[PDB]
Amino acid sequence: ANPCCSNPCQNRGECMSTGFDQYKCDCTRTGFYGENCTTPEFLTRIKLLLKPTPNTVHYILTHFKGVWNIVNNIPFLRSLIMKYVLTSRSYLIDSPPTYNVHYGYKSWEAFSNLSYYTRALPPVADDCPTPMGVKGNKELPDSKEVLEKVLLRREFIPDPQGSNMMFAFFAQHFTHQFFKTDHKRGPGFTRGLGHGVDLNHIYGETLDRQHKLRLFKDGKLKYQVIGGEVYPPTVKDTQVEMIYPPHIPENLQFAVGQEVFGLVPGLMMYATIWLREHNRVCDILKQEHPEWGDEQLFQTSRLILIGETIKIVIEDYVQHLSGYHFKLKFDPELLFNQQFQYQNRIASEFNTLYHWHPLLPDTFNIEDQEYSFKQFLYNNSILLEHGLTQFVESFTRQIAGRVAGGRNVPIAVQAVAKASIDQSREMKYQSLNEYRKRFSLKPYTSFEELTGEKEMAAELKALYSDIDVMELYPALLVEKPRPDAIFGETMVELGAPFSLKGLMGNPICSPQYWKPSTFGGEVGFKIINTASIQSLICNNVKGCPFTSFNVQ
Amino acid sequence: ANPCCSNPCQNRGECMSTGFDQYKCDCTRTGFYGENCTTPEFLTRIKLLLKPTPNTVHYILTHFKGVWNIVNNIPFLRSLIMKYVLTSRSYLIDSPPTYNVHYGYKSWEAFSNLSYYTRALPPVADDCPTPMGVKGNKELPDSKEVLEKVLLRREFIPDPQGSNMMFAFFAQHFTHQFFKTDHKRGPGFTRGLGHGVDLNHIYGETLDRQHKLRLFKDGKLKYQVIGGEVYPPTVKDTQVEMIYPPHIPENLQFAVGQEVFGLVPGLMMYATIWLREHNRVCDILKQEHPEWGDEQLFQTSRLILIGETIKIVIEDYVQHLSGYHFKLKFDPELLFNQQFQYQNRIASEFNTLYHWHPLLPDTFNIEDQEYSFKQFLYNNSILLEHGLTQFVESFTRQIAGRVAGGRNVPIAVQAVAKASIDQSREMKYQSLNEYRKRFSLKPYTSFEELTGEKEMAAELKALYSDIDVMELYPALLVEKPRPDAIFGETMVELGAPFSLKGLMGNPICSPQYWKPSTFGGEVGFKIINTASIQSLICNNVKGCPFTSFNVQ
């Protein structure tokens, strides 16, 4: 009934009704004009002919290793290239933010309420005749059927990029500081009001929780020693709320501060490592500043760990999953002469696309043993049993599964994969093709183009009937992967903008924060600028086992 | 004890301790180097001997009415000029913010906790030997003595720029959406979590309060009719809490939603005007959008009012108090090709300097009656008796007091002025001269240079003993005014940057927001772009009396 229900405005033009049956498109700053912002201005015509496809670019980034070897060692070209990826991605994100589940137009309520996930595309209106607006049937296909036909795993498909379990659990640990859906309110509500990398999954979302996790000497976090090893403190000792089955032994009720982290020993492995790391930095910082009190040591160490995280995320984690020969660089200075907003709001679609459960293996192989999901969940005695050094060595060696390419969601998390479909619809997401347009991709013309094969394509066609009505979540996991890659085109071209905006958006990247005094001087500053996944493990894990995100 | 107590680092360098008795200066990006960042880089040398003093620039702006008469008419020149005032002012403020009452170093708590006012200069550390750090006596001069000698009004001093009571009350009403001290918590803490121009003073800080004030029809705010005139609804009807003395007879307990606006009829006057204006705009939107529901009517009207507010503050309000012949311009597009952060945090010092109580008369003259403070306070009946038309006519006609120049604080609010001195010390403000360097002004070398006269200068010199220990607040009210001006140099050079960043940093000024469709189409947009103090009054006040911020 709403005249904007068909999504008539193209190229990021905004649609507004102008009567019960009529509409208008606002083409301001789009580079186009016309009734629907489809006829381009002269300069636009030119930018367009010059613009290479995401697929062409990706080819160039994953070939010619010899040329990249050179570029990488010419600091000024490396900086030039990295500047361009940074800015070209980030300009895809609305900032300040617009739209959320309840608002398909820009209200002060949508801007000011930090309780919502923001939304890259506005929700389909409540009165549209079909779930996707105007197209398709009255009803999307039964979600159980989609799940079973194209998502559930038959045989385990390994990631051809060699992503290991260190990678999979880092992703889960790092992302769960900003994906924290508030189930009391609905999907599309978050409990992580920091809307980014604030390390609340280490220090607690609220001051109350932080103070419970704190030792209040030397800036340190509370902990216990079992065997000769440092672990998070207990729930009984700190009185912080955690989520645990009621039968779990007092000693194994680890507290840590993201309340959900005790349900997977892999999460708790990183919780322990980061806890250890905070306290290691306190020691260095105390050594450097005998004058300092507890508050300042805690607060400075926290700023340093924020930097270390972003460093690692860009130069090891994103580096790995990109498959690029170009060496990505964490360097806030790249943006000091650019237009850039040091702020971030996490999008609901970013939560959605980050559901990478295909990464999970059939069993968890902690060198020697092989645990089933049932055995693994809410079970920290495994961590105690094997210790951190083992775990690192084991997780470094076990391949994770491929994410795109279809049929690789472990049955053990089927209920989760289904909820993603259901909550997507509940939140009234626009189609896959609407999202491809939003991010400057060409809409798919058939399911067979989406998957690159024929079997899954046909199953999808019988269910959806029209490609322009295919949904975002199912499509990301079923999409044709890049040649020997973990992800398809859509995952990368939507993921990258959200990701890099969240990373560089941080206040510690702003000119006023990005200087040595912010981090306790030159010493604290180097901890950030030399941080890596290897040194994180090396410094904090008993032996000094080798790791990477790659299974070698 | 703190080695940084002397504030050694100059030119915006940051001090850090490096041991119990030593310190280091971080000169990064200051344009200076050396132990205290006082030795300028070459390009910095050129900039300095090419930079006109604030007084030179002020002179140029307040003279040559002939030339400015030409420039105001070259859209091209007006723009580039306004662009330069916006950018150079704003670069003076840290954004993202740094420091608050409790943190004289960066910290994530200082960044993330919106309950604090930010701070342009960090507090003086608790353990410093003297209140100003290292200079002056172990104690600051008795605040009663400072108050009585150089602050209290003997004879009324009228503003030479001709400010009237429309100006004074506009000031109070507008600033009180972002200055809302949380007294429960302390000075340094605010209840305006929106940190800017969000119109919470019309709509409420929380969603619970907003809903209580809302009609839920046609997007409107609840109101009552008394005689044939529209007034805010009552406390008993809306259940929204207000602050009123118990003797107030319900029925005059107007709601309005900044809970403090009952205690001055001049505040209730504007509250009434903006409430009428909101419902007026709903009528206009409804006419353009027969198909819109209540929610979008409400939200769109709110965005439009925000726009009107910003427009009026810049082109009528700031315009008047500036005394410039150059015609200021509200135009977000001026910043689209510039680096600029669309975010704000209101500074404690901004609150401090806006304590413009000298504006207030000894009696409030509403055509025919001369009301005293005791009679004016929390007394809406005066508003009901005279009406909005009378009130605008009277307020437009009565002059305000001069602010700088000393000895013009109304005796009626002497307790308030004393609290300002006392709270500044409580919040550990740095000295006047520290704040002057921070905003690129020369430190004053004697009290006599500060005041421009002799008698107060000598009074101050006996109290403070040393000019480098003079306090900021008392100084602003005692400072030598610009020629026939309302304020002295310090007020303007501090206030302008806080004010302009506060205005332009609003999300509706950002590229994605600044477009016709945000405000419901070209007619909604035009309300923003044509708004003025005169038009605000003409549309909503019975007859349509002439108004101005200037006495005629």
Ligand code: HEM
């Ligand atoms: C043993 C490993 C894992 C288990 C047991 C698990 C299970 C779960 C469960 C029960 C949920 C909540 C679903 C809901 O509340 O609707 C969830 C959500 C989620 N998962 Fe996993 N998962 C695992 C691994 C991973 C991995 C490797 C990733 C990689 C990115 C990931 C990404 C996410 C995300 C982004 C959410 C949404 C979080 C939120 O909105 O609060 N998970 N998972």
Ligand code: HEM
């Ligand atoms: C009848 C008129 C006025 C009265 C009765 C009045 C009285 C007061 C009082 C009692 C306070 C609270 C003091 C405290 O908490 O220590 C205050 C604060 C303040 N006043 Fe006024 N004042 C008036 C007009 C004005 C005007 C015209 C301005 C112009 C800017 C102004 C600026 C301020 C500011 C910025 C604060 C701080 C508010 C906060 O932090 O919440 N006042 N005033």
Ligand SMILES: CCCCCCCCO[C@@H]1O[C@H](CO)[C@@H](O)[C@H](O)[C@H]1O
């Ligand atoms: C030749 C490769 C070096 C430059 C690196 C650019 C990497 C990211 O470039 C991306 O590619 C897409 C298609 O071109 C665009 O849609 C994106 O906006 C752009 O950010």
Ligand SMILES: CCCCCCCCO[C@@H]1O[C@H](CO)[C@@H](O)[C@H](O)[C@H]1O
């Ligand atoms: C510097 C040399 C430039 C050569 C660019 C090679 C581009 C070929 O790249 C091809 O583009 C397609 C995109 O639609 C993809 O489907 C293919 O997988 C990809 O190989």
Ligand SMILES: CCCCCCCCO[C@@H]1O[C@H](CO)[C@@H](O)[C@H](O)[C@H]1O
């Ligand atoms: C992973 C186990 C759960 C899914 C089985 C039930 C749904 C049936 O799904 C079918 O499974 C076949 C075998 O893979 C495919 O050949 C078909 O294309 C597919 O539709």
Ligand SMILES: CCCCCCCCO[C@@H]1O[C@H](CO)[C@@H](O)[C@H](O)[C@H]1O
């Ligand atoms: C284009 C020519 C520029 C010259 C403008 C005149 C500058 C005078 O500026 C002077 O600066 C002093 C600063 O302390 C003030 O005390 C004076 O009041 C002020 O007149």
Ligand SMILES: CCCCCCCCO[C@@H]1O[C@H](CO)[C@@H](O)[C@H](O)[C@H]1O
């Ligand atoms: C006369 C030239 C056009 C008018 C623009 C200047 C008005 C505001 O510019 C101000 O001037 C001061 C002195 O240089 C600086 O200290 C301020 O930082 C700057 O914002």
Ligand SMILES: COc1ccc2cc([C@@H](C)C(=O)O)ccc2c1
């Ligand atoms: C969250 O999911 C992703 C997926 C791919 C990404 C790729 C980049 C880099 C390589 C990019 O192409 O600019 C960054 C973040 C990414 C995040």
Ligand SMILES: COc1ccc2cc([C@@H](C)C(=O)O)ccc2c1
């Ligand atoms: C709160 O106090 C002030 C005082 C002077 C101001 C001057 C400007 C303009 C004219 C300017 O000088 O840039 C803006 C805000 C201002 C605020």
Ligand SMILES: [Cl-]
């Ligand atoms: Cl990410």
Ligand SMILES: [Cl-]
């Ligand atoms: Cl202002």
